[PDB]
Design an enzyme around this catalytic site. Structure first.
Site, PDB file in Angstrom:
ATOM      1  N   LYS A 120      27.793  34.977  73.934  1.00  0.00           N
ATOM      2  CA  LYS A 120      28.830  34.860  74.958  1.00  0.00           C
ATOM      3  C   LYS A 120      28.794  33.565  75.775  1.00  0.00           C
ATOM      4  CE  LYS A 120      29.153  39.901  75.237  1.00  0.00           C
ATOM      5  NZ  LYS A 120      29.075  41.117  76.100  1.00  0.00           N
ATOM      6  N   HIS A 179       1.719  25.066  75.950  1.00  0.00           N
ATOM      7  CA  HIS A 179       1.436  26.324  75.275  1.00  0.00           C
ATOM      8  C   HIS A 179       0.188  26.848  75.974  1.00  0.00           C
ATOM      9  CE1 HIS A 179       1.327  29.455  72.477  1.00  0.00           C
ATOM     10  NE2 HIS A 179       1.300  28.797  71.332  1.00  0.00           N
ATOM     11  N   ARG A 218       9.205  32.238  75.199  1.00  0.00           N
ATOM     12  CA  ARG A 218       8.970  31.073  74.354  1.00  0.00           C
ATOM     13  C   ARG A 218      10.375  30.528  74.175  1.00  0.00           C
ATOM     14  NH1 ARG A 218       5.645  30.686  68.739  1.00  0.00           N
ATOM     15  NH2 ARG A 218       3.949  30.362  70.260  1.00  0.00           N
ATOM     16  N   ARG A 225       1.997  35.363  65.957  1.00  0.00           N
ATOM     17  CA  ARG A 225       0.810  35.651  66.776  1.00  0.00           C
ATOM     18  C   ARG A 225       1.084  35.790  68.266  1.00  0.00           C
ATOM     19  NH1 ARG A 225       1.180  32.784  63.673  1.00  0.00           N
ATOM     20  NH2 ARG A 225       0.130  32.438  61.680  1.00  0.00           N
ATOM     21  N   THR A 226       1.723  34.778  68.841  1.00  0.00           N
ATOM     22  CA  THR A 226       2.001  34.788  70.270  1.00  0.00           C
ATOM     23  C   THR A 226       2.759  36.033  70.742  1.00  0.00           C
ATOM     24  OG1 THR A 226       2.072  32.367  70.124  1.00  0.00           O
ATOM     25  CG2 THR A 226       2.784  33.367  72.215  1.00  0.00           C
TER      26      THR A 226
HETATM   27  N1  LIG Z   1       3.189  25.838  68.963  1.00  0.00           N
HETATM   28  C1  LIG Z   1       3.044  26.986  68.309  1.00  0.00           C
HETATM   29  O1  LIG Z   1       3.910  27.857  68.254  1.00  0.00           O
HETATM   30  C2  LIG Z   1       1.698  27.168  67.600  1.00  0.00           C
HETATM   31  C3  LIG Z   1       1.458  26.029  66.605  1.00  0.00           C
HETATM   32  C4  LIG Z   1       2.491  25.956  65.475  1.00  0.00           C
HETATM   33  O2  LIG Z   1       3.577  26.556  65.634  1.00  0.00           O
HETATM   34  O3  LIG Z   1       2.177  25.278  64.473  1.00  0.00           O
HETATM   35  N2  LIG Z   1       1.625  28.463  66.904  1.00  0.00           N
HETATM   36  C5  LIG Z   1       1.585  29.635  67.533  1.00  0.00           C
HETATM   37  O4  LIG Z   1       1.629  29.771  68.755  1.00  0.00           O
HETATM   38  C6  LIG Z   1       1.492  30.852  66.610  1.00  0.00           C
HETATM   39  P1  LIG Z   1       3.032  31.801  66.569  1.00  0.00           P
HETATM   40  O5  LIG Z   1       4.223  30.739  66.359  1.00  0.00           O
HETATM   41  O6  LIG Z   1       2.963  32.678  65.220  1.00  0.00           O
HETATM   42  O7  LIG Z   1       3.237  32.643  67.770  1.00  0.00           O
END
Ligand SMILES: NC(=O)[C@H](CC(=O)O)NC(=O)CP(=O)(O)O
Ligand SMILES: NC(=O)[C@H](CC(=O)O)NC(=O)CP(=O)(O)O
Ligand SMILES: NC(=O)[C@H](CC(=O)O)NC(=O)CP(=O)(O)O
Ligand SMILES: [Zn+2]
Ligand SMILES: [Zn+2]
EC number: 2.1.3.2
Lengths: 310, 145, 145, 310, 310
Positions: E84, E134, E105, E54-55
């Protein structure tokens, strides 16, 4: 023929107080007056499907001291069961046509019991089956307690560490509970507590036991301090919070101990017993291990000889 | 009320236990007339299941193997349209072949051997001790094959 | 005597089939009264099974679902002790939920979806084509969970 | 609204001769007169959970060729489905809230069908679902077959290789069977034979097909020689005997070949087609691959744009 | 220059109620009237060193939705940092010479903060840094909470699951605590409890919070039931007992639920939310996911464009 002649030795639960005493008395005699030709012409199988140093080596050594031959394996990876997919059942079926007795250690509980169902007239000696039983450990433990304390009655025994997966304490508690007046102290994490089927056994016999969260809490009352290793090989990941020893014994923790108390440990020890304990008069895990020789010679002699007059 | 010349009638089977009995006992395996009544009204038991197999009879311990599932059930041997034998399932010493040890590390799972437990009534429930791993469990836990 | 006041009665079920139907569509998972007759005489069919379920009714589709196992059966809709409706199962265009696709690489085994197969009278038997798979098997080989 | 507007493209079995014809016509128009802004403001997902070179790249090139933006992944290993245990369903449920259309290839049969049940109003285009369907391949294949044969009916077609796992021949056989008078020759090991549901469908339309043990046998009368790769990644170990191509087309097998005959291959090829074939006039698999552009621009145009290609 | 122009978006702790409100308002305006060219000529980096569905996809979709181009990677395995031995610092030092903004991320806490010290005038947007923050999740969460509750203050909020490693609940709790009168209910195993630095911050503002052992307990008064996934990939083996969700919301637990109550989940979900919940009126996690578009378009608009949404 003696009581144990040709008998399987799977669980302390199948042995009586007399059976134990018999083993111990024979152990004392063999220790004092060796019989190098006792098991001459005998061929015993030493089969270990799980790691080991003391149990396998002492057993095989005991066989040689009695003059028997040893055949076997310390790893199943190269047996047909390990490469060709053979059942334990079939394995015991064929090995039982080669030898006079089978000593076996296995990762699954009940493996030794099952073996007896495929060995015909060949006695099976359980060197450890999963986290269930460890009969010969108890035999040597009882032998060690007996000579350091001169009794197996009215003792104050504390068992520490992994009581849930410790096949060592499962067998040792049942045996001591066959003697009178013993009092038990269980010092273990909540998740690795002494199994309930053991406790119900103690209540059934009207034997006093109790739980404690520290060793210091009982140090001044015990005759035997039995420490154990966390059986990480048997832990469910949902118990991985217990890998590290919760109770670490140090020389300094023995300040108010009875002068006669002995610290025992089936071994190996990871960190539950600091090395500075090794030099104290209480450290008795090595003498203990050494008694594995006399106890196992005693067992091998009683099972394979109709009569022993020493 | 039904009727059969010869056979056995299991009555007072707890609700939702009858169908199970038919299943794990392969009772429908026969070609003998059978009559089943599920969720039937019962005077003192509320509801109940009832099975009828004409020309069939159960084992004295299978009736006990029944003591685990339907402790207050009643088997009636019938002959010439009459109850020549009324029995009550009592806890047996051990159960063989039908149970599955709840311990995943029990050798009984990997090898060619029949299961076997020692029955022993505990405080409120019944305790089952495996012949192999020597572990003990509440019969509630073991009854989940 | 035997006559339900209201519900459905599946008559003329083949032998050894009535039990299958009971565990397949799990018709016993209910609080409703159910009387079952297995290996009963009929003559026009030799021996047949019979399932009766009170306060329970079956839509045409539900009745057609039986086509696959009890084709010559007859579903009697009953109300007020009277048979107000009589229908017979006719081959359904598809079967859902009950069966399991034999193709191990089918996405249906891993995902949260109900099974579904198109029904085709091929010849000697019936062919089942998975909605997801598009692979078709004979009803004989397509298992049920 | 053209017949294919907002429509899912999952299986050739769901399409009609008219639908197929509509794509080819559109492809021809767009090849002749590209429409760079036709899909401006569109965001399309390119989700490949399985390896791909032509399908994903030609698809993305086409999206850009029509002015659309692209988001996605070519490896499920870094999606939340790959590292957090997420269902494909929830994955589609969320992606369908971001894009205008979803292109997806997946290792399990029926994945695309599955997606349509969780995408809502977002059309799912099957880029390949296991060994089942490969709808856009057939489309480019048909475009190529007509470009080189002048028609899509009354042709002799030979399909060689792994016909069981070839999602390519499954879709194409169904498509060609929607046209009239086509003759089918199937050259494949008995273990990787054309599935029954395809043959039945052929018998259904009184279409003529026959099995053959060699290419030579039909080289004289085939208009299109469709070569395929053994789908090793889909084989069960009990079929590993067929990993190595049984039929290898070499330049010296093209002598009895008709002047119009063309060799096609969905690609990639292992050794089923020697490289000496590459320079012959019959080789047309690269031209075929390039046609993937037009066919995919066409389909995209038809699914995402309401009016016919103006 | 709007308050957020050229600003780093690293932690909710750095933002104020006004900043949050500004994003939501902007999101509303853009949802109502999209601005396809608002970010034309911008090149943004999408750097995911950790899994994401999603993110990353909603972020890239948003960039395209606003007319910007995207470059990046979804797996550090093929960057020079992965093969590297390159530092994250040097990686940011060079990428910041190519793009107008960096979305990243990362598996380690504070990676985003770290990047800001090497990006220069290029704004870093935290897409998640370990189990810490987040920020863009909270933004979409707030947008959703208001869309379904009509306000962001005086709400009863229950957060269930892994609150210790949930970077989601860390940011959101801090954001909701910037608004007035919110009641917090924390349902989580003692091992994965809400960190102290969050509770302290709450006590600081005299905010009311309490721990609970079940959902049922608070189902009657919660306005938002925020479910979370156990962050298995972040757990230490000594916490593996908590891998399996303790709280599973089923459709049958929604009876005492208020008509306005909505179930949210940052996703992905394992089994903490049965699928029978999906069809109920309370289920809103997919709607929530879609809101990621608007929130992220909003933030991007505010950080890269000088004037407010005209
Ligand atoms: N912290 C996260 O990445 C949260 C909660 C989780 O992973 O359970 N989830 C999201 O942001 C969705 P994504 O990992 O599909 O981008
Ligand atoms: N159960 C056992 O194997 C006990 C206790 C333990 O392993 O911690 N130890 C032994 O028998 C010593 P060994 O593994 O060296 O033969
Ligand atoms: N089914 C396929 O993927 C066919 C045939 C094959 O893989 O041999 N090939 C393609 O679609 C080309 P691609 O995998 O490079 O996208
Ligand atoms: Zn067992
Ligand atoms: Zn299928």
């Amino acid at each position: 023929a003696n009581p144990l002649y040709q008998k399987h030795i799977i669980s302390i639960n199948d042995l009586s107080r007399d059976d134990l005493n018999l083993v111990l008395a024979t152990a004392a005699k063999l220790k004092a007056n060796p019989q190098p030709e006792l098991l001459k012409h005998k061929v015993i199988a030493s089969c270990f499907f799980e790691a080991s140093t003391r149990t396998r080596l002492s057993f095989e050594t005991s066989m040689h001291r009695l003059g028997a031959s040893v055949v076997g394996f310390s790893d199943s990876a190269n047996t047909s069961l390990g490469k060709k997919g053979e059942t334990l059942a079939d394995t015991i079926s064929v090995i039982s046509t080669y030898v006079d007795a089978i000593v076996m250690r296995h990762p699954q509980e009940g493996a030794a019991r099952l073996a007896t169902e495929f060995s015909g007239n060949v006695p099976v000696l359980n060197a450890g089956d999963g986290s269930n039983q460890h009969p010969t450990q108890t035999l040597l433990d009882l032998f060690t307690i007996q000579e350091t304390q001169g009794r197996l009655d009215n003792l104050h025994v504390a068992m520490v560490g992994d009581l849930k997966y410790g096949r060592t304490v499962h067998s040792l508690t049942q045996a001591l509970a066959k003697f009178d007046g013993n009092r038990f102290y269980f010092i273990a994490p909540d998740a690795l507590a002494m199994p309930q089927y053991i406790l119900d056994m103690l209540d059934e016999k009207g034997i006093a036991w109790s739980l404690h969260s520290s060793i210091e809490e009982v140090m001044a009352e015990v005759d035997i301090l039995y420490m154990t290793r966390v059986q990480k090989e048997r832990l469910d990941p949902s118990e991985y919070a217990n890998v590290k020893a919760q109770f670490v014994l140090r020389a300094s923790d023995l300040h108010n101990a009875k002068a006669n108390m002995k610290v025992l440990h089936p071994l190996p020890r990871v960190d539950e017993i600091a090395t500075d304990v090794d030099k104290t008069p209480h450290a008795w895990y090595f003498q203990q291990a050494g008694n594995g020789i006399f106890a196992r010679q005693a067992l091998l002699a009683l099972v394979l000889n109709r009569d022993l007059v020493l | 009320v039904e009727a059969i010349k010869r056979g056995t009638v299991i009555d007072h089977i707890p609700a939702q236990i009858g169908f199970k009995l038919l299943s794990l006992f392969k009772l429908t395996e026969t070609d003998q007339r059978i009559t089943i009544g599920l969720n039937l009204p019962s005077g003192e038991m509320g509801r109940k299941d009832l099975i009828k197999i004409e020309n069939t009879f159960l084992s004295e311990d299978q009736v006990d193997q029944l003591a685990l599932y339907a402790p207050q059930a009643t088997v009636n041997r019938i002959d010439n349209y009459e109850v020549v034998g009324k029995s009550r399932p009592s806890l047996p010493e051990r159960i063989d072949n039908v149970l599955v040890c709840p311990n995943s590390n029990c050798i009984s799972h990997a090898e060619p051997v029949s299961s076997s437990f020692a029955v022993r009534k505990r405080a409120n429930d019944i305790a089952l001790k495996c012949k192999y791993c020597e572990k003990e469990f509440s019969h509630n836990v073991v009854l989940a094959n």
